[PDB]
């Protein structure tokens, strides 16, 4: 059996909203140490990696390890039937995942049930990055929305001083400069090009943390990281335009 109960179920809700618009289906690794997910978008330009530590749930049980094949459109939709104040539980009896939504008043309970799939894992080895920038989540989100109205790609340029996001298009060019809550840990200056289309999928993760961390090194994917308080992280990786 596998049974994870989560008092703050709104995390699941926010986790799936941030996933459903990037990746359709993904594999959920359940072990003693919690939930791991690792998945590329349908065009192999990006990769998502979610970690939900087992000690982050209210109850956590896992007899055997499970590689659950999940339709994230379906799971999103179900999770929309959870209220923000519901206690969410998941249950899998070793090809069906159940979701139970327990309302505060203890007089409304919702059972939802969803057929699981058989899905076929590399990953991005962690490095030292030349630049690493911790900035407010809302700000990085706003910078991406803004700049996608000017061009398709954003040149990120990082010095010890600050970070500069630039896009140009047919209707002019723009630059947004930030200085040093914004914190840079440069060990070498970087300059890279990424697709705004993809960064704006990532920023659906914004309600999970008031902060985001961008990690850059030359000619290697960007890492856009959202810390899920006392549970783990949602990590996005995006290949560069060269």
């Amino acid at each position: 059996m596998f049974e994870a109960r989560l008092v703050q179920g709104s995390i699941l809700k926010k986790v799936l909203e941030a996933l459903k618009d990037l990746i359709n289906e993904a594999c959920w690794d359940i072990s003693s140490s919690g939930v791991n997910l690792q998945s590329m978008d349908s065009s192999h330009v990006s990769l998502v990696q979610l970690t939900l530590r087992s000690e982050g749930f209210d109850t956590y049980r896992c007899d055997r390890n499970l590689a659950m094949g999940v339709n994230l459109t379906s799971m999103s939709k179900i999770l929309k039937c959870a209220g923000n104040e519901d206690i969410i539980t998941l249950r899998a009896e070793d090809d069906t995942l159940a979701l139970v939504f327990e309302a505060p008043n203890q007089e409304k309970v919702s059972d939802y049930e969803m057929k699981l799939m058989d899905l076929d894992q590399l990953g991005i080895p962690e490095q030292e990055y030349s630049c690493v920038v911790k900035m407010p989540s809302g700000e990085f989100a706003r910078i991406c929305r803004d700049l996608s109205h000017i061009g398709d790609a954003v040149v990120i340029s990082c010095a010890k001083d600050g970070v500069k996001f630039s896009a140009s298009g047919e209707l002019g060019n723009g630059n947004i400069k930030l200085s040093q809550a914004v914190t840079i840990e440069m060990n070498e200056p970087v300059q890279l090009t990424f697709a705004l289309r993809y960064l704006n999928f990532f920023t659906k993760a914004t309600p999970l943390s008031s902060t985001v961390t961008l990690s850059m090194s030359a000619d290697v994917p960007l890492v856009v990281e959202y810390k899920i308080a006392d549970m783990g992280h949602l990590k996005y990786y995006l290949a560069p335009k060269i």
Binding site: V45, L122, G123, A239
Partner: peptide
């Protein structure tokens, strides 16, 4: 010009 993240995968 867009690289795939295949290749960075290990």
């Amino acid at each position: 010009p867009q690289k795939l993240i295949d290749g960075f995968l290990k």
